Amino acid sequence: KVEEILEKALELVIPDEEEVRKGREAEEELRRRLDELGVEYVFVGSYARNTWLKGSLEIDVFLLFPEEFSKEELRERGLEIGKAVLDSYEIRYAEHPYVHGVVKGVEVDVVPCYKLKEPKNIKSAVDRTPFHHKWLEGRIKGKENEVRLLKGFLKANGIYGAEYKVRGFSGYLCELLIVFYGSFLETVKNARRWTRRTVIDVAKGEVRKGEEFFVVDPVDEKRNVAANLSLDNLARFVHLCREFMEAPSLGFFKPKHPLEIEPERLRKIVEERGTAVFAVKFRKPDIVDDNLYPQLERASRKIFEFLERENFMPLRSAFKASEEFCYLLFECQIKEISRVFRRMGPQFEDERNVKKFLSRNRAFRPFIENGRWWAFEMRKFTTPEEGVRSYASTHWHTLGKNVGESIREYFEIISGEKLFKEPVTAELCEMMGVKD
Amino acid sequence: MKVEEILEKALELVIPDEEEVRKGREAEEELRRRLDELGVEYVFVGSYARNTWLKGSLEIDVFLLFPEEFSKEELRERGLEIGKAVLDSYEIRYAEHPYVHGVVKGVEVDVVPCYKLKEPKNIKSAVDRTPFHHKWLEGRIKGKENEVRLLKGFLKANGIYGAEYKVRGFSGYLCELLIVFYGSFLETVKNARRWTRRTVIDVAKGEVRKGEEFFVVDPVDEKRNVAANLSLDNLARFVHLCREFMEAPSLGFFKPKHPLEIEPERLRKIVEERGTAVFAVKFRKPDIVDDNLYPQLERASRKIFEFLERENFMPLRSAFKASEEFCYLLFECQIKEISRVFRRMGPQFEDERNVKKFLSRNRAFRPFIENGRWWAFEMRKFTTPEEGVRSYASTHWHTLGKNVGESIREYFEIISGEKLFKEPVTAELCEMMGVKD
Amino acid sequence: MKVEEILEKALELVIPDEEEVRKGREAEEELRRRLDELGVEYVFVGSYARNTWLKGSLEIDVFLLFPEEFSKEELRERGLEIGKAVLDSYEIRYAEHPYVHGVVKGVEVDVVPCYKLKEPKNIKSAVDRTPFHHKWLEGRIKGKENEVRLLKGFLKANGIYGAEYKVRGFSGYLCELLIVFYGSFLETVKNARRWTRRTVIDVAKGEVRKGEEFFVVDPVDEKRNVAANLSLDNLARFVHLCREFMEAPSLGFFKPKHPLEIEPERLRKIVEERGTAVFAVKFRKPDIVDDNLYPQLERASRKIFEFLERENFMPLRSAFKASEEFCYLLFECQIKEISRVFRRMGPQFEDERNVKKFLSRNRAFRPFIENGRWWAFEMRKFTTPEEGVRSYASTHWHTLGKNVGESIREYFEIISGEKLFKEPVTAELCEMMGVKD
Amino acid sequence: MKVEEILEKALELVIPDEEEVRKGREAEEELRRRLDELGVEYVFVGSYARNTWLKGSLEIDVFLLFPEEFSKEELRERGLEIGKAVLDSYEIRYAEHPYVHGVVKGVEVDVVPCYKLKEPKNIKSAVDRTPFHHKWLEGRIKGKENEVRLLKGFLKANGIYGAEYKVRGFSGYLCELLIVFYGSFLETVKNARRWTRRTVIDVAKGEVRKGEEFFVVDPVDEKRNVAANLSLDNLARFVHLCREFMEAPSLGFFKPKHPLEIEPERLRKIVEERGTAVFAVKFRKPDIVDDNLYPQLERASRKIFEFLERENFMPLRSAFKASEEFCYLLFECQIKEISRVFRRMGPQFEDERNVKKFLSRNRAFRPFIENGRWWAFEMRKFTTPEEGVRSYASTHWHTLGKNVGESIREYFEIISGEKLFKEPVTAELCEMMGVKD
RNA sequence: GGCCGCGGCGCCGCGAUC
RNA sequence: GGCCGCGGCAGGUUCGAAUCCUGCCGCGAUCG
RNA sequence: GGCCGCGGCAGGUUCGAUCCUGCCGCGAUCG
Ligand SMILES: Nc1nc2c(ncn2[C@@H]2O[C@H](COP(=O)(O)O)[C@@H](O)[C@H]2O)c(=O)[nH]1
Ligand SMILES: Nc1nc2c(ncn2[C@@H]2O[C@H](CO)[C@@H](O)[C@H]2O)c(=O)[nH]1
């Protein structure tokens, strides 16, 4: 039965007592250090509401300073306080330079911000986090386990987190959904009837039809909490919910193992497909995931669009970011194209331009077709691999700011059996739909 | 060298020698003698009557004029009786109505029945128009016959003389109107350089204006376009030749180009460098007139071309040739081979019902979501243009024209690779690929 | 009493009652609910969406909008797939694209797939041009829905509403464009009296001018004639009705005419008095839609009518009728019986050879000369119009329309006399002969 | 492994586990409690009472006894009332007579009213025999319950268990009589190898003899055939099964068979190799029980088959499937296409009266004499089996069964070619064509 | 799918119409 | 209620039906 | 800081512009 499955799930989902005592002792000690300095602070985030998922323990503390101190005034000051409270700290750059460190083994964040009267003086996202907490701290009580079930259900299917690496559901969005539908089970049941135009207005407690999938923030009606939830991940979630209800299982809460596959079998698969499968290798820029992945996504789309234009008929693309290198994977229906192509000339009555078009020397004679001139010309490349070698060599600049600059410094085109040796088997299996 | 020198030298290739003219006069006299014996009203029309016929293209046209009171059937009976009774060796041909083609003292002759109309307003049949055409031209073309012959020779040598569907070019009647309008061959070539696809040449009103298509107003019937069957591409070819001519005149324009005759090993080498897929569809030529066959060969080629487009084989050009026995549909494709797998479109994720059906079917690989919609990897039936066309010719033979489609249904085959170079199509392949000498 | 009062009362015959309106509103709401569950882009268009549908003719037209990237096959797959899922008791119909017709909460619904085009130039399909028609009228027709609704009822009551081949009248779209042009039903009727067979009505430019045909310019496409399939005769009828309507306004114009059925005995006496020959060609109705059948019944009757004209049976008028199981081609001729002997045309007296052949034939009677031509007395194969058609229909079945032709080849019979009046054709017979009361 | 171990292992797949028995026992004693409170005559019969129900097919049967002092109308009233006032979640099923079916503490139950009766000399309703059937078996089956279960499982695993019209196999009652007769499952299988279509098994007389048809004599009524609804073909499939089992015993005979799995492309290619015409008649499934639906599908499938034979399309076999919404009638024909023309037999040459009538019809070709009789060429309305069935389904809907025929009268569609392989009927197509894994 | 018109010599092909 | 086998009728197909295609009434059988 | 959507300029492609590419401004998202 479902009720027993969700009970079994709580084991994988709820943090153990040791993890709580580790955080509780880190919290109580973190306060003593903040009280002595006599600074205005507040505990928020998934910890303050006791909704953090198992293994993902993090303490979020916000410093509430007056409105008088503008921008860089409290930035450096709040940063200074973060050092005199944390053990092994390090400066991390978000919208505002905040401080990430550790206190008695537990990771901690210290973000400075304004102390605003109402959510009208909102400047940035950091100014909304306190209001998100204030709105949730009361309503979420007695539903902490419902949140964690949802967070686990999503993280197991790789769609938990609003960061660009995932483009899934935020922890804040999860809690809003539980407050709306009451429980995890009710959320999954109703999600089956979600569409790409569903509007979930939490504050007004109703569901409307809109222009896009829009979860209205109770703090700011103008804001979509699911703004970075991709359309596909929305589609995937709706489907996962449908599958869960038809045949409930604890498997939905356990992560999947990458498809084990021998390079020889993988070769035999590509042969059966008759496609060209290759990858663009290059060194990973030293930048944050929130900057890296949107760029890899761009570089992929750009090369993909180039392959379309050059009539190589690409099927799908993919990318992987390892420790030192990045890979842009492609699969095209055309292994090789004729050297000859057709270049369109002007209409026959346009004598001036026809003369210019015909003046160019070519191996074969131009011709007329539908009252317009045409000419046989030669391609510079006949394979998709050679085409991308050319594109990545001349159009490196449009492949993302940092990714484009790395490709400028170095890149290979790896295909055939040599590709299967690279650590990209998990993604090649995914984009081709290999099953076993 | 000089313009007038070339035009003078061109007349030799284009004017009938005095022997051919004598051959025609002798038949003409005998033909009139046999007709007068029968008490029928006739009229010598066409190229021969106006003395504007091309060298080695002698053919007499005689139209029989009957009262309007006659029925279509009576018109025919009297026509065929008088046809057979005047020609040494006749045969019944068809064109709107039956007429009699035959020979008289070596010279070929056409005897056509039509109504004797006083006003050019009672024109039901097109044959009823010919007497009016001749009537309008016999006076205005006098002195200009050599100019007409030049234009005809210029057009013929460049394969665009004749309004039949095999040529889709300039009719002889059209050539005469052009000379009457412009005054001479040279002046026609000159002004032709500024012809557009919207040019309207109205001889009867003596003006040039703009229209929706290239229109040559018939002086006999202003609603008729004399250049109706002049294709856009052949119009373009003519305008371009006229420019090429005035830029660098030459007697070569009036001579036919000997077909590109190359060996099957060089032809293999050209296709090799082009990197394309060249192949053909061989089948038996239907037993029909060219005016039926060629429009169907066109349709056949177009349909297969459109098929190759849809199937992503990326065709460059198509061509066709007709032997006395067989017919060939030629094609060149940029893709010699395509992958087995392809993307099959599924429903949007919101569809509980259809997504279930879509995912129900068995496939070698997992379907996936993209842009909020399900897609699935499926396999192609064919992976080369040759096999794709083989499949299409077998299943969609009916769309390749009536007579051509039925013939393909009985028997066809895909002659590809080097085996095709042995077939008699090399001249068409070189034209199709733009091969130089 | 006065025109304005008649119209005010005519509105009742024409506007949908509150119950029929609500019937649609409930279907619409349910239809939208189903379409939203599938995430498909759609739009309610046509007569219902603009709230101009005639009383009793409630029909909802939803158009599915797909990207231009979609292949025609994909366009059709998704369309059909969505239709069946949204309609209760669906029925696959065919036009330009295969679409789905069905029922939702007791209301008729059409679901047509098409392309979501931003440019009205990318139009290739007629279903692609519908979404543009709707948007051009959506704002303009607002506040005039009852004026359109009058024009429809006025037309339908006189059997000239609908541009199908069965009616060859005014389309619904045409009706709305005319109200937008003249402002109201009354202004449309008043000006229609001055229409001609050359009148052009430019809606976008809001001006009238002369042309070749009766042309109502589509605001979305200047090249298209909205009143293309409006027959010349139905045009004349509408003009006349408008003139008759203003000279003596009546609510009777907005009401259908009674069947006007008469006893077989009266009809027998009428034909006797007229002294004509009235017969029919009966045959099985081809299993084809009306749009294919009626143009063929028109051709069939026309061809047979022309045969009777050639054979001197002097046809007056013709008509046709399609029942459920059979089809009838009705004819009335002034000659019940013609002489067995007739004149056969021979050669002129000069033609010695052919006169010999002509006079050598065995004949009951001697040939003779008349106006320098030999004539002969020969015997007709048939001597009544029924005999003649029985022949022609069997030896020229192939010209009587494709489907109609093959059905006549399978089976047909010439019905006349008492046995014809028993067939379901009396209404058409009376209309043909101009019987009154 | 060997037979003894196979049957041992089979008991696992066959005997209900202690959890299923407990689920039933608690339901029984509870059901008895409610029958004692009202104080009504009742009896537990059927497979449950004798403890022979197959694994997973748990179903309690309880017959309500009533005195003979009741008419056929009074029994259902206080019969169903006692039924509804005993079952928790009850409904109403319709069989021989109205009866209540519902679930009681997990398991479903049937409450059938009937007369008590003294001896089987009455012989009236079918439900009046069930108590006598149980009484005859309850003593003789004790100690053989597992043998019964082995037979029932052996049959169900091969789709021939159950006397319902959807199966036309062996009834549960029949299975128990056989075990009583032969002593065990293994002895039944051994002797069944020598069964014929004329074998008579008399249980009460303990003898086998030859008769007119396969007949298992009911011990209660010698005139009744217990295996009456066992089809001839299923009897054949059983005799063959037993022979295969004894020749090479295996546990696989007790496990149901795989669903096959085949791709549309292979299925298309197969049909191409057969050179046959495969198509289906698709329509909406009438909302009726299987026992009414399947016999009608058999009738419709048969009627159309006989039509295909009669129309010389030479059908090979026919199959049918019933989904939740639609029903399919599958057919395969050796003739994809037939000539337009055919022969019709006329009268003998002496019969002048009828020769005149026969020769009066308008036909495309001349009739001819052959062996003294007159014959005539005539034209078919259709030339393919698809189109032939389309005509037949349209004009003979009424004979394709009551409910099925009515649903076809409303809507049906002929699905041929590759489009048929998309429908959910691949399993039925593979079985029909004898496609091997 | 059928119908009309155009073009070439009723047979074919192409535009318009439902 | 539906299906099946006979018995008596009533239409349709056909030049013409005891016979081929259908429908109604009566009896028997099967299944729920 | 990066990415995405708009708005306005500027190179390139090309026979010439549809396409490609860059710069500035506004808004959105993530850190
Ligand atoms: N179609 C038709 N066949 C008949 C008719 N009467 C008899 N037959 C059939 O004609 C054939 C010859 O008749 P018989 O000599 O057997 O009486 C037989 O097959 C017989 O059944 C009838 O009225 N119509
Ligand atoms: N009227 C008619 N009788 C036939 C035919 N064939 C056989 N017969 C038989 O011939 C006999 C005529 O007396 C009857 O027994 C008929 O059944 C036929 O084609 N027409």
Q: Quickly list DSSP for D308-326.
A: HHHTT--EEEEEEEE-SSE
Ligand 2 mutation target, pool D343, D344, D345, D348, most atoms within 8 A of CB? D348
Residues 6+ apart with CB under 8 A from B123: B117, B129, B132, B221
CB atoms within 10 A of CB C213: 14
Whether chain B has a CB inside 8 Å of the CB on D418: the answer is: no
CA-based torsion, D218, D222, D226, D230: positive or negative: positive
Which protein residues touch ligand 2 with a CB less than 6 Å away? Answer: D 347, 351, 354
CA distance A196 to chain C (A): 7
| β partners of residue C293 | none
Q: Report d(CA A360, CA A347) in Å as an integer.
A: 17
**Resolution, rounded to a tenth of an Å?**
3.0
* 3-state SS, one letter per residue, for chain C: CCHHHHHHHHHHHHCCCHHHHHHHHHHHHHHHHHHHCCCCCEEEEHHHHCCCCCCCCCEEEEEEEECCCCCHHHHHHHHHHHHHHHCEEEEEEECCCEEEEEEECCEEEEEEEEECCCCCCCCCCCCCCHHHHHHHHHCCCCCCHHHHHHHHHHHHCCCCECCCCCCCCECHHHHHHHHHHHCCHHHHHHHHCCCCCCEEEECCCCEEEECCCCEEEECCEEEEECCCCCCHHHHHHHHHHHHHHHHCCCHHHHCCCCCCCCCHHHHHHHHHHHCCEEEEEEEECCCCCHHHHHHHHHHHHHHHHHHHHHCCCCEEEEEEEECCCEEEEEEEECCCCCCCEEEEEEEECCCHHHHHHHHHCCCCCCCEEECCEEEEEEECCCCCHHHHHHHHHHHCHHHCCHHHHHHHHHCCEEEECHHHHCCCCHHHHHHHHCCCC
CB atoms within 10 A of CB A353: 13
Of the candidates D85, D116, D143, which is a domain's last residue? D143
The residue behind tokens 């984009």 is A431
Chain centre distance of CA D399: 20
Chain centre distance of CA D153: 17
Query: Residues B198, B216: contact at Cβ < 8 Å?
Result: no
Residues 6+ apart with CB under 8 A from C186: C3, C7
Two structure tokens written together for C322: 């399609």
Residues 6+ apart with CB under 8 A from B433: A364, A376, B270, B271, B274, B317, B332
Q: Which residue of B has its CA nearest to A354?
A: B240
Question: Any atom of strand F under 7 A from CB of D125?
Answer: no
Q: Report d(CA B338, CA A311) in Å as an integer.
A: 12
CA dihedral B244, B246, B248, B249 (to 10 degrees): 110
- Inter-CA distances, C122 with B305, C74, C136, Å: 22, 18, 17
Nearest to D343 by CA among D362, D314, D367: D367
CB-count exposure of residue D247 (10 Å: 0-12, 13-18, 19+): exposed
Query: Residues A349, A311: contact at Cβ < 8 Å?
Result: no
The residue behind tokens 């079917």 is B361
Tally of domains within chain B: 4
CA-based torsion, C159, C160, C166, C171: positive or negative: negative
Q: Report d(CA C220, CA C203) in Å as an integer.
A: 10
Nearest to C281 by CA among C393, C384, C397, C432: C393
3-class DSSP assignment, residue D215: strand
Nearest to A178 by CA among A169, A170, A187: A187
**Contact between chains at C38 and B310 (C-beta distance less than 8 A):** no
Q: Report d(CA C337, CA C275) in Å as an integer.
A: 12
Tell how many helices (H) and how many strands (E) occur in chain D.
Answer: 15, 16
CA terminus-to-terminus distance, chain C: 25
Q: Report d(CA D408, CA D410) in Å as an integer.
A: 5
Residues A120 and A147 in one domain: no
Residues 6+ apart with CB under 8 A from B141: B50, B52, B148, B176, B179, B180
Neighbour subunits, A (≥3 Cβ pairs < 8 A): B, C
Question: Any atom of strand F under 7 A from CB of D354?
Answer: yes
Query: Residues B341, A273: contact at Cβ < 8 Å?
Result: yes
CB atoms within 10 A of CB A210: 16
- Assign residue C113 the CATH number of its domain: 3.30.460.10
Q: How far is the CA of A398 from the C1' of G23 (A)?
A: 14
CA-based torsion, C326, C331, C332, C334: positive or negative: negative
Q: Report d(CA D65, CA D114) in Å as an integer.
A: 5
Residues 6+ apart with CB under 8 A from A330: A276, A277, A278, A279, A280, A303, A304, A307, A314, A316, A317, A384, A388
| β partners of residue D326 | D284
Whether chain C has a CB inside 8 Å of the CB on A209: the answer is: yes
The phi and psi torsions of A112 (rounded to 5 degrees) equal -80, 150
CB atoms within 10 A of CB A14: 17
Q: Report d(CA D417, CA B426) in Å as an integer.
A: 40
Question: Any atom of strand F under 7 A from CB of D92?
Answer: no
Nearest to A336 by CA among B377, B275, B383: B275
Whether chain B has a CB inside 8 Å of the CB on C349: the answer is: yes
Query: Do you know the residue count of chain B?
Result: 437
Q: Report d(CA B330, CA B317) in Å as an integer.
A: 8
Nearest to B6 by CA among B266, B228, B346, B249: B249
Rg (CA), chain B: 28
Q: Report d(CA A413, CA A329) in Å as an integer.
A: 10
Query: Residues D263, D437: contact at Cβ < 8 Å?
Result: no
Q: How far is the CA of C210 from the C1' of E17 (A)?
A: 22
Residues C270 and C405 in one domain: yes
Q: Where are the alpha helices (DSSP H) in A310-410?
A: 351-359, 384-394, 401-409
Ligand 2 nearest atom to the CA of residue D373, by list position: 19
Of the candidates D143, D161, D193, which is a domain's last residue? D143
Residues A307 and A214 in one domain: no
- Determination technique used: X-ray
* 3-state SS, one letter per residue, for A297-335: HHHHHHHHHHHHHCCCCEEEEEEEECCCEEEEEEEECCC
Question: Any atom of strand G under 7 A from CB of A301?
Answer: yes
How far apart are the CA of D347 and the centre of ligand 2, in A? Answer: 7
Q: Report d(CA B318, CA B278) in Å as an integer.
A: 10
Q: How many CA atoms lie within 13 A of C105 on its CB side?
A: 16
Q: Report d(CA D254, CA D259) in Å as an integer.
A: 16
Q: Report d(CA D254, CA D146) in Å as an integer.
A: 14
Q: Which residue of D has its CA nearest to C403?
A: D381
- Inter-CA distances, D362 with C140, C283, C403, C414, D366, Å: 59, 12, 18, 10, 10
- Assign residue D352 the CATH number of its domain: 3.30.70.1550
Question: Any atom of strand E under 7 A from CB of B228?
Answer: yes
For chain C residues 337-376, those near strand E by a CB cutoff of 7 A are none
Ligand 2 nearest atom to the CA of residue D354, by list position: 1
Q: Where are the alpha helices (DSSP H) in D39-161?
A: 46-49, 74-84, 130-140, 145-156
Q: Report d(CA A241, CA A256) in Å as an integer.
A: 17
Containing structural domain, residue A425: 259-338+383-436
Residues B284 and B334 in one domain: yes
Q: Report d(CA C229, CA C171) in Å as an integer.
A: 9
Q: Report d(CA A134, CA A44) in Å as an integer.
A: 9
How far apart are the CA of D348 and the centre of ligand 2, in A? Answer: 8
* 3-state SS, one letter per residue, for A271-295: HHHCCEEEEEEEECCCCCHHHHHHH
Residues D276 and D328 in one domain: yes
Nearest to C291 by CA among C166, C403, C376, C159: C166
Q: Which residues of D touch C390 (CB under 8 A)?
A: 362
Residues B102 and B208 in one domain: no
Two structure tokens written together for B414: 């895909």
CA distance C39 to chain A (A): 6
Query: Residues B114, B148: contact at Cβ < 8 Å?
Result: no
Binding residues of A for Mg(2+): 58, 60, 109
Q: Which residues of C touch A305 (CB under 8 A)?
A: none
Q: Report d(CA B424, CA B253) in Å as an integer.
A: 27
Nearest to B319 by CA among B301, B334, B294: B301
Q: Report d(CA D13, CA D324) in Å as an integer.
A: 29
Residues C396 and C318 in one domain: yes
In the sheet that B107-115 helps form, which strands lie side by side, from edge to edge? B41-45, B59-66, B107-115, B97-104, B89-95
Residues 6+ apart with CB under 8 A from D352: none
The phi and psi torsions of C285 (rounded to 5 degrees) equal -75, 125
Nearest to A42 by CA among A112, A117, A135, A100: A112
Query: Residues C330, C345: contact at Cβ < 8 Å?
Result: no
Ligand 2 mutation target, pool D344, D345, D350, D351, most atoms within 8 A of CB? D351
Residues A28 and A173 in one domain: no
| β partners of residue C88 | C103
Nearest to D128 by CA among D136, D137, D120, D140: D120
3-class DSSP assignment, residue D17: coil
Whether chain B has a CB inside 8 Å of the CB on D325: the answer is: no
**Contact between chains at B436 and A364 (C-beta distance less than 8 A):** yes
Q: Report d(CA D324, CA C300) in Å as an integer.
A: 48
Question: Any atom of strand F under 7 A from CB of D401?
Answer: yes
Rg (CA), chain D: 27
Query: Residues A20, A27: contact at Cβ < 8 Å?
Result: no
Helix, strand, coil shares of chain D, percent, nearest 5, are: 40, 20, 40
Q: Whose CA is nearest to atom 20 of ligand 2?
A: D347
Pairing between β-strand D60-66 and β-strand D107-115 as defined by DSSP bridges: parallel
3-class DSSP assignment, residue D148: helix
Q: Report d(CA C86, CA C30) in Å as an integer.
A: 9
Residues B372, B377, B383, CA angle at the centre, nearest 5°?
A: 135
Nucleotide with the nearest C1' to C403 CA: E2
3-class DSSP assignment, residue B415: strand
- Assign residue B254 the CATH number of its domain: 1.10.1410.30
3-class DSSP assignment, residue A148: helix
CB-count exposure of residue B229 (10 Å: 0-12, 13-18, 19+): middle
- Assign residue D309 the CATH number of its domain: 3.30.70.590
- Inter-CA distances, A122 with A114, B169, B340, Å: 9, 77, 56
Q: Report d(CA A329, CA A300) in Å as an integer.
A: 8
The residue behind tokens 């993302």 is A400
Q: If you measure CA to C1', which residue is closest to nucleotide F2?
A: D292
> Which amino acid makes up residue D109?
V
Nearest to C78 by CA among C103, C49, C105, C100: C100
Residues A298 and A357 in one domain: no
**Contact between chains at D261 and B362 (C-beta distance less than 8 A):** yes
Nearest to A431 by CA among A306, A270, A290: A270
Q: Report d(CA D298, CA D286) in Å as an integer.
A: 14
Residues D415 and D308 in one domain: yes
Mutation pick from C70, C222, C348, C371 vs chain B, by most beta carbons of B within 10 Å, is C348
Whether chain C has a CB inside 8 Å of the CB on B266: the answer is: no
Chain centre distance of CA C391: 29
The residue behind tokens 């317009």 is A372
> Which amino acid makes up residue B124?
K
Q: Report d(CA D211, CA D189) in Å as an integer.
A: 21
Q: Report d(CA C331, CA C316) in Å as an integer.
A: 8
Chain centre distance of CA A214: 18
3-class DSSP assignment, residue D8: helix
Of the candidates B226, B259, B292, which is a domain's last residue? B259
Question: Any atom of strand F under 7 A from CB of D229?
Answer: yes
> Which amino acid makes up residue B426?
T
Residues 6+ apart with CB under 8 A from A121: A67, A114, A127
Residues A49 and A6 in one domain: no
CB atoms within 10 A of CB B345: 15
Q: Report d(CA C174, CA C148) in Å as an integer.
A: 10
Buried-exposed string C308-328: b where 16+ CB fall within 10 A, e elsewhere: beebebebbebbbbeeeeebb
Residues A307 and A396 in one domain: yes
In the sheet that D199-202 helps form, which strands lie side by side, from edge to edge? D207-210, D199-202, D215-217
Pairing between β-strand D341-348 and β-strand D373-379 as defined by DSSP bridges: antiparallel
Taking phi first (over 0 means left), then psi (-120 to 50 degrees means alpha), and beta for anything else, what does residue D183 get?
left
Pairing between β-strand C98-104 and β-strand C107-115 as defined by DSSP bridges: antiparallel
Q: How far is the CA of D78 from the C1' of F1 (A)?
A: 22
Chain centre distance of CA B399: 21
